């Protein structure tokens, strides 16, 4: 082959040395437009702001807007001292797209994005996040100002439906995949950053937005995504539940979902981290309580199932990050409460409805029984002890007997039949159980004399 | 208010056969005839339904894939996606899609075990409103589909059988559970005189229609038994209360006292 | 094309596909003849349908719900009884193979009969004969009745003497040896002894080679018509008189 060798070089070299750092130009570019009746970058956005408000119905893919959205998207104690110096330079840049009209375009474009998932919309979020990121209130104020102004409806009308498709792990595809959510993960962070720094004026806006003649409720919808995510993850459990050892792609694809799940709870928190009690009242009537139930079922079992060997722990560390935050919303779904408050009593309800699920998670926390045990029978210069000797050791120093077999399996079964103690202390895991213990006290302290809780 | 695990329930269905608006129980004695058959309910008055048999206790409500895992081996609310086991209240043999023609589609009928794919039945709602993950509303449209053959639970022209054609089954619960020591409706019990209520032994010239109090003998015997039937197809299982209508089916006769 | 791929089904599609086909587009045997009398493209439709269903196969469960439609059973014979037709029979056979015991052969027939018409290569049947030769490729899998039907199939082996499909028929002959009363097979082997008389056509000598491995299995039976086989042996010496392919043929002659 001759010419074919030419073209292959055209490909691989493009895959190779073309993909590099010259693309870091953009600050030089954005500053160029920031120079000196508006400066050009302001001119630039004002154009797309025009373009987005054109009545295209089906908003056009736009290879120019797509580019400048990314351009602007990448425009963004001593460690603290330069942190503010970074945060200022961040704030100086975040304001650069803010004093200029870009704050408005993002939100506008999305209104034109409507039902579309069409790539360009993904790039807008990348700008709509980068403008925020730090929670920059000034934008966040203006970004609100735009909406009660226009009362355009089509903003949320875009987002609502946008989440209704959005993406899910959906198992049926997986088997087929065996032989997109990054955009979902992105968007909820977008919604999060609309509520970063607790804008009760704005947080309520998501609850109902009174100015719009329509009243979309993002929250109940953003929960529906979670409940929608729930079905997959729960179904994703049972599929590997018989397979014990997990596929790397399954180990990977699951993590991809957890990245999405981790984000969504954060949004639920930002809709509630502010003590905006009416938002959580909405959420209290939500099927989110059912949503809470199921993750625990995941957590009841996926967690212990991950708890078998070192290869799983990476993902197991991921799931613990998930459960960590999951109570953080559930804790924050409480933070402002009367003693026998209704919102609390409902989480009094879930723990009993999820009885066995919440039981199993706790037994994982017995782990010190994660350390002291071998001292009673250790012998052989490496921290080793035989699994049977470790079993005989556990008869006394008393963890429940059915669980005792699990510790061997949860160990390592290293070197034929012997077990290190120090390796067998990883589970890190403590943060959840802190938060659980917080939560379970937080319940007993807010709601007492409810014996099933006690 | 939502359908749940261990809820006594029956498949009410619906039909407008001829002109009669014929809703009906799906039931079989099980014993003596495992094949299921109709127990019509549109005439819940002059010709009362055999409520004793149609009752079907719920057992478990595993997810589809979850159910597939249980094959490889807690009053939970039902959800529109789980398959469900369906215990017969009487024979206790669980409901299934048995293989028999009656057209080309399998007859409904009981197993003798929790085991096997036949036992289970996915619930797909038809309505656009209803969807997966929703707590299953009482009386909403639902379509059972046997996991064993994935035929819909069809009401063939009348006899029930699984078939690829749908039928809009509806399912009103009898009752959740019971508080101990208190009488639910649909229950079978003796009525003690403080000694007990009874009838005559079989092959009496009476045709066993004469009614008696009696002590001894019968008090252990089956003829002493009496099934209460509060007069509703739906929440018949509600805790019994005086001052509400309730025909008293006798047990051994199957006759109503009158 | 959606499910059959290179051969064995991409079941991941096929399950769902059959689930959809089961649920909507619903006498499926008499209708065949009703169409044959008369329109025909609807018969091509049911044939494509069965061919489609045949291209897919807990999956053993789905195989069973497909078993709901051995209803055809001898539709292969019905399709055969129609002899514009053979394609349909090919579908019936692929379905029969994928979904569905040597007893069954007796009433699989009479496509080997039809091949007798094909031996004289000189309606749409002449255009269709090729499909029938293609049919010869397909099978490849009281006892006296089997001796009769095997006499007939052996007559089809005589019909075998397209050419690559004929090599597949040679595979049918080698299958006739390896699968296996045996003595009637020795009579058809006498037919192969006359075929040996024809040999010394070289492919018919390869038929004499399969007849040689059959002669080895018969030697196992040996350790009547056997005298005729000795005549076939001296005829093999005449084959030695007849003289690369001849070398291997000489080895089978040994």
Curated annotation (Swiss-Prot), chain B:
Domain MIR: 75-126, 133-174, 180-231
Post-translational modification: The N-terminus is blocked. Channel activity is modulated by phosphorylation.
Cell location: Sarcoplasmic reticulum membrane
First-to-last residue of the parent protein present: 12 to 292 of 5037
Job of this protein: Cytosolic calcium-activated calcium channel that mediates the release of Ca(2+) from the sarcoplasmic reticulum into the cytosol and thereby plays a key role in triggering muscle contraction following depolarization of T-tubules. Repeated very high-level exercise increases the open probability of the channel and leads to Ca(2+) leaking into the cytoplasm. Can also mediate the release of Ca(2+) from intracellular stores in neurons, and may thereby promote prolonged Ca(2+) signaling in the brain. Required for normal embryonic development of muscle fibers and skeletal muscle.
Tissue expression notes: Detected in skeletal muscle (at protein level). Fast- or slow-twitch skeletal muscle.
Name of the protein: Ryanodine receptor 1
Extra remark: Binding of [3H]ryanodine indicates that the heterozygous channel is activated by Ca(2+) concentrations 4-fold lower than normal. Single-cell analysis of cotransfected cells shows a significantly increased resting cytoplasmic Ca(2+) level and a significantly reduced luminal Ca(2+) level.
Family according to the record: Belongs to the ryanodine receptor (TC 1.A.3.1) family. RYR1 subfamily.
């Amino acid at each position: 082959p001759t010419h074919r060798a030419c073209n292959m070089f055209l490909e691989s070299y493009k895959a190779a040395w073309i993909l590099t750092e010259d693309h870091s130009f953009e600050d030089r570019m954005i500053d160029d437009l920031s120079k000196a009746k508006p400066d050009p970058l302001h001119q630039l956005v004002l154009h797309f702001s025009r373009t987005a408000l054109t009545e295209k119905s089906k908003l056009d893919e736009d290879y120019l807007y797509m580019a400048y959205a990314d351009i602007m998207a990448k425009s963004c104690e001593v460690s603290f001292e330069e942190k503010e110096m970074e945060k200022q330079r961040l704030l100086y840049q975040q304001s650069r797209l803010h004093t200029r009209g870009a704050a408005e375009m993002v939100l506008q474009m999305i209104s034109a994005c409507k039902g579309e998932t069409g790539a360009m919309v993904s790039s807008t979020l990348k700008l709509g996040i980068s403008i925020l990121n730090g929670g920059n209130a000034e934008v966040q104020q203006k970004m609100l100002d735009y909406l009660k102004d226009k009362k355009e409806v089509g903003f949320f009308q875009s987002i609502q439906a946008l989440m209704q498709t959005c993406s899910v792990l959906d198992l049926n595809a997986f088997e087929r995949q065996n032989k997109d959510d990054e955009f979902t993960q992105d968007l909820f962070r977008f919604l999060q950053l609309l509520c970063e720094g607790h804008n009760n004026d704005f947080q309520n806006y998501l609850r109902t937005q009174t100015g719009n003649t329509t009243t979309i409720n993002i929250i109940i919808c953003t929960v529906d995504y979670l409940l929608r995510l729930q079905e997959s993850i729960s179904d994703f459990y049972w599929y590997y539940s018989g397979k014990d050892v997990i596929e790397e792609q399954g180990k990977r694809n699951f993590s991809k979902a957890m990245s999405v799940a981790k984000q969504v709870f954060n949004s639920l928190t930002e809709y509630i981290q502010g003590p905006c009690t009416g938002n959580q009242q909405s959420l209290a009537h939500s099927r989110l309580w059912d949503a809470v139930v199921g993750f625990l079922h995941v957590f009841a079992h996926m967690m212990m199932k991950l708890a078998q060997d070192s290869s799983q722990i990476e993902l197991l560390k991921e799931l613990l990050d998930l459960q960590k935050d999951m109570v953080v919303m559930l804790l924050s779904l409480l933070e402002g409460n009367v003693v026998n408050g209704m919102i609390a009593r409902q989480m009094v309800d879930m723990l009993v409805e999820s009885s066995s699920n919440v039981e199993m998670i706790l037994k994982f926390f017995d782990m010190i029984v994660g350390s002291e045990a071998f001292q009673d029978y250790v012998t052989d210069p490496r921290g080793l002890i035989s699994k049977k000797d470790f079993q005989k050791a556990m008869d006394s120093q008393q963890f429940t007997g059915p669980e005792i077999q699990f510790l061997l399996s949860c160990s390592e079964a290293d070197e034929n039949e012997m077990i290190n103690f120090e390796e067998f202390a990883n589970r890190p895991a403590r943060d959840i159980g802190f938060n659980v213990a917080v939560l379970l006290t937080n319940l007993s302290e807010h709601v007492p004399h409810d014996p099933r809780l006690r | 208010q939502f359908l749940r695990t261990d809820d006594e329930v029956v498949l009410q269905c619906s039909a407008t056969v001829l002109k009669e608006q014929l809703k009906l129980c799906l039931a079989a004695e099980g014993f003596g005839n495992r094949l299921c058959f109709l127990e019509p309910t549109s005439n819940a008055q002059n010709v009362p339904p055999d409520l004793a048999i149609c009752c079907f206790t719920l057992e478990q409500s595993l997810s589809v894939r979850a159910l597939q895992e249980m094959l490889a081996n807690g009053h939970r609310t039902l959800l529109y996606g789980h398959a469900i086991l369906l215990r017969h209240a009487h024979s206790r043999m669980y409901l299934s899609c048995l293989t028999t023609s009656r057209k080309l589609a399998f007859d409904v009928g009981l197993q003798e075990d929790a085991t096997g794919e036949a036992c289970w039945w996915t619930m797909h709602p038809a309505s656009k409103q209803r969807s997966e993950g929703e707590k299953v509303r009482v009386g909403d449209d639902l379509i059972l589909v046997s996991v064993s053959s994935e035929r819909y639970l069809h009401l063939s022209t009348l006899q029930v059988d699984a078939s690829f054609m749908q039928t809009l089954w509806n399912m009103n619960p009898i009752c959740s559970c019971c508080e101990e020591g208190y009488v639910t409706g649909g229950h079978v019990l003796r009525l003690f005189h403080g000694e007990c209520l009874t009838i005559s032994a079989a092959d009496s010239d009476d045709q066993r229609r004469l009614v008696y109090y009696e002590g001894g003998a019968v008090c252990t015997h089956a003829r002493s038994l009496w099934r209460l039937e509060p007069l509703r197809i739906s929440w018949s299982g509600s805790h019994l209360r005086w001052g509400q209508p309730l025909r008293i089916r006798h047990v051994t006769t199957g006759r109503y006292l009158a | 094309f959606a499910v059959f791929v290179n051969g064995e089904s991409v079941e991941e599609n096929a399950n769902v596909v059959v689930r959809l086909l089961i649920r909507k587009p619903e006498g499926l045997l008499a209708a065949i003849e009703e169409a044959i009398r008369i329109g025909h493209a609807i018969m091509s439709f049911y044939a494509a349908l069965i061919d489609l269903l045949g291209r897919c196969a807990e999956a053993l469960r789905i195989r069973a719900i497909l078993r709901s439609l051995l209803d055809d059973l001898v539709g292969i014979i019905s399709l055969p009884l129609q002899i514009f037709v053979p394609d349909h029979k090919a579908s019936m056979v692929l379905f029969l193979d994928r979904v569905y015991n040597q007893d069954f052969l007796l009433h699989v027939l009479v496509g080997f009969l039809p091949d007798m018409r094909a031996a004289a290569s000189l309606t749409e049947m002449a255009l269709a004969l090729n499909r029938y030769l293609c049919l010869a490729v397909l099978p490849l899998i009281p006892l006296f009745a089997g001796t009769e039907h095997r006499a007939i199939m052996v007559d089809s082996m005589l019909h075998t003497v397209r050419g690559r499909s004929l090599t597949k028929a040679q595979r049918d002959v080698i299958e006739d040896c390896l699968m296996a009363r045996p003595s009637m097979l020795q009579h058809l082997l006498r037919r192969l002894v006359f075929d040996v008389p024809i040999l010394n056509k070289m492919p018919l000598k390869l038929l004499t080679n399969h007849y040689e491995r059959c002669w080895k299995y018969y030697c196992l039976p040996t350790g009547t018509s056997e005298e005729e086989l000795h005549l076939t042996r001296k005829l093999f010496w005449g084959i030695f008189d007849s003289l690369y392919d001849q070398e291997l043929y000489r080895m089978a002659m040994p």
